[PDB]
Every structure is written in C-alpha cells, then in structure tokens.
Amino acid sequence: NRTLTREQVLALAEHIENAELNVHDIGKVTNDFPEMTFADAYDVQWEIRRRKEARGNKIVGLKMGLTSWAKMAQMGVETPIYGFLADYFSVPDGGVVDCSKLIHPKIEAEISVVTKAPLHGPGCHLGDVIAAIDYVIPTVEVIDSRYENFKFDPISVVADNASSTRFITGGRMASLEEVDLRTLGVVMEKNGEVVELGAGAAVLGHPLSSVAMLANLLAERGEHIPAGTFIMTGGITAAVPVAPGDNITVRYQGLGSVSARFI
C-alpha cells in the first residue's frame, strides 16, 4: 500500500519540511504523486519527524486532525489523521507568535490530554482510554498548511504533518473527574470579538475518542501511545485565520483561557 520509492519519501519530506522551515507554500504533493497513499504520506510525515529529531528537536506530542465525522465523510476518509508536535511548536499561554515564520495560519481551540498509562490499538475505543487519562489541557493549535491550494487533501496534509506548526497551552490542567469533555464549552475571542463557540463533542462526539483513534492509527505502523503522551484531540471550533496584530483568547469553561498575540 505504498507507491513512493524510498528516495521519494526522503525527498518529499525534505521538500515539505523546507516549506515549513523556510516559510513558503508548495504545491500539494499529491499533484506530483497522485497515487500517494496514506501509508506513503505517513512515511513522509515520519521522515519529517526523523529530520527534526535528527537535528535535536524533541517531539513533545501528537495532534489529531479530521476529527469531525462530517469532515471525514466530506473527504471520503474513514478515520482522522494525526501529526506530531515538535518542541518549538510550543507557545506559552499569552505568548507572542511571530507570523513571519508562518504562511497563512489559523487557530483551533482544542482540548489536549496527557496520558498516565500506555494505550494501544487496534480496537481501542473510549472505554479503554478513560483510565489512561492523567489530565486535560486547554490548547489552541496554530495550523498552517504548507500547501498553497484551496482544497484540503488529506493525503498531502498527512505528509505535511497535518499542518502542524504551533500549539498554545494554557488554562487549568484538570483531572478527567472534573471535566465533561463532551459538554466542555469553548469560546474563541479574536480582537475582543467572539468569533467561534464549540463544545468538546465536536471532536467525534467525544474528544477522548480521538485518543482511541490515535492509538488505532499508530497501531497501523506498529506504534502506540506511551504513558505521558500529550495529545491534542482535535479542533472543537472551526479554524480561525490569524494575522499580525491579532490577539486571541479562547475561554474553556471551568478551565480558564488560552491567549496569544500575533506579530
């Protein structure tokens, strides 16, 4: 289920990573490799991860994309996608984000978890995930597809590390006992204006399901979710474009807020 030669995987990873590192968009790689499979794309993504680890970057978490059934159906895929988070993606609450290093960023309000027990697929579901959750963390992702197109293409997006670029953690880190992740409300404010509202249920119906799906996806490549893994479970709100000069704050009910300023 792979159509790329290894040379192509390596060349694509370099090409796609450079778009991120050098802050410029590129054509969707499925335009030059229309037969690219998800296995191909994950090979490319994991190769980008390897490139980053090889230069000393710590991989500090994972994120989940396409965590909406409606969006999956629209894309004609049956599962979400994942990407990894590198250490330098991290932005502190209230932190300043330099858009000169970004292409056309948007933010998404998410709830992250840190696990305290290993999780694996296949066949992982909500019930298997609950005991393994240590705490939850309000997290705003900054996504920034390195592709210049308008169509979301899941395979290219996977190769592009699911458009990962920054994540902003903040608010209170709460145990699962304190939080109903389905009804967890978020309010995204941009420049003083409420621009998106959402509830955790927007992530598959239950954000923790995203963790189970991640375990299942990782299991396809013979990986799992080790205890202590930080996982951004998916966009609760529609993604909101940001630009220099923007200030955003996302309030999480009962868990404080996550803010960032863009320059």
- In angstroms, rounded to a whole number, what is the distance separating the alpha carbons of residues 95 and 102? 15
CB of 101 to Ca ion, least distance (A): 18
CB of 197 to Ca ion, least distance (A): 17
Q: In the complex with Ca ion, which residue's Cβ is closer, 129 or 236?
A: 236
Residue 141 in marked binding region: yes
- As beta bridge partners, residue 97 has 262
Residue 196 in marked binding region: no
- In angstroms, rounded to a whole number, what is the distance separating the alpha carbons of residues 113 and 232? 7
Residue 189 in marked binding region: no
CB of 198 to Ca ion, least distance (A): 12
Q: In the complex with Ca ion, which residue's Cβ is closer, 15 or 251?
A: 251
Q: In the complex with Ca ion, which residue's Cβ is closer, 11 or 59?
A: 59
Residue 126 sits at φ, ψ, to 5 deg, of -50, -45
Residue 114 sits at φ, ψ, to 5 deg, of -115, 130
> Could you list the residues that contact Ca ion (CB under 5 A)?
93, 108, 141, 170, 235, 256-257
Coil/strand/helix, residue 86: strand
Residue 63 in marked binding region: yes
- Which DSSP letter does residue 237 get? S
Supply the Cα-derived Rg of the chain in whole angstroms. 17
CB of 239 to Ca ion, least distance (A): 8
Q: In the complex with Ca ion, which residue's Cβ is closer, 141 or 160?
A: 141
Residue 20 in marked binding region: no
- In angstroms, rounded to a whole number, what is the distance separating the alpha carbons of residues 242 and 263? 10
Q: Give the residue numbers of the binding site for Mg(2+).
A: 21, 108, 110, 141
Q: Give the residue numbers of the binding site for Ca(2+).
A: 108, 110, 141
